[PDB]
């Protein structure tokens, strides 16, 4: 079968690269391909897998497998139009930029977005990708994608639709802040403030000595993981170094 080749080439790729990121993505792409009975999606997965085996840049294998996972989630049976729209924006935006951080950020944001069937969430990342498609400011593009991915992580977590409603305004402020020329340090803080507000918890951000120190109490275990994923990805995307220290459900972040 067309899925039989996908399983063979996917399992044959995990025994090649020694990056755990390649292992989880190639396996995830194959698993999504078994649901999709669309032969056109099975062709994109088979072409991306066969082209990723030949390439050995590893980071190119990442971006190639990212397209395989994204085009497979869109090929999921009974896919809403807006889902396919979000993917096209990310696929186009990845082709329209040379920074590998934008190609990864755009693809990963759309992948996490299609995970949740939340219509308020699908529109927040869709309008965000449209705005990044127009501007050429790389920092603005990365901030829009970092906010779209963090917003998607809140929706995948399954927070209240009211909580996501508040988080939407934080995304709008975040995209506007990068439009006004905000620093990369302060934009990450806006990403953090969207997480604490979208999960119904309180914060206590401090600031003294050219180093913002945001402490957050009340976060449960699962909430600290969703915070850690969004804050880390946004930190790597914006390009700033942060420290996320844990101690009895009191996360403390140090940006600089």
């Amino acid at each position: 079968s067309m899925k039989e080749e996908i399983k063979r080439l996917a399992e044959e790729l995990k025994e090649k690269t020694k990056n755990e990121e390649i292992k989880r993505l190639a396996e995830e792409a194959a698993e999504l391909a078994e649901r999709s009975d669309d032969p056109e999606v099975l062709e994109v997965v088979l072409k991306a897998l066969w082209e990723a085996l030949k390439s050995k840049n590893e980071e190119k294998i990442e971006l190639l497998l990212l397209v395989a996972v994204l085009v497979a989630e869109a090929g999921s049976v009974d896919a809403v139009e807006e889902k396919l729209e979000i993917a096209l924006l990310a696929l186009k935006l990845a082709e329209e930029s040379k920074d590998p951080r934008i190609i990864r950020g755009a693809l990963r944001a759309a992948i996490a977005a299609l995970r949740s069937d939340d219509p308020l969430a699908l529109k927040t990342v869709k309008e965000a990708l449209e705005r990044a498609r127009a501007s050429k400011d790389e920092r603005l593009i990365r901030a829009i994608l970092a906010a779209a991915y963090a917003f998607a992580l809140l929706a995948v977590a399954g927070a209240s639709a009211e909580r996501l409603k508040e988080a939407e305004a934080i995304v709008w402020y975040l995209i506007a802040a990068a439009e006004k020329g905000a620093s990369p340090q302060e934009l990450v803080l806006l990403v953090i403030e969207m997480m604490v507000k979208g999960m119904g918890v309180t914060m206590e951000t401090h600031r003294s000595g050219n180093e913002v120190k945001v402490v957050i109490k009340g976060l449960h275990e699962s909430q600290q993981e969703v915070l850690l994923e969004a804050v880390l990805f946004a930190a790597e995307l914006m390009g700033v170094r942060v420290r996320i220290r844990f101690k009895g459900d009191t996360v403390t972040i140090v940006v600089r």
């Binding site: 190639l64 993917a87 082709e95």
Partner: peptide, 23 residues
């Protein structure tokens, strides 16, 4: 209908980005 349009648009663009990342 338009879902069939965006269906082709996602599949074509995906195969175009794959070729761009390959070279």
């Amino acid at each position: 209908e338009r879902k069939k349009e965006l269906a082709k648009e996602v599949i074509e663009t995906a195969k175009k980005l794959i070729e761009k990342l390959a070279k």
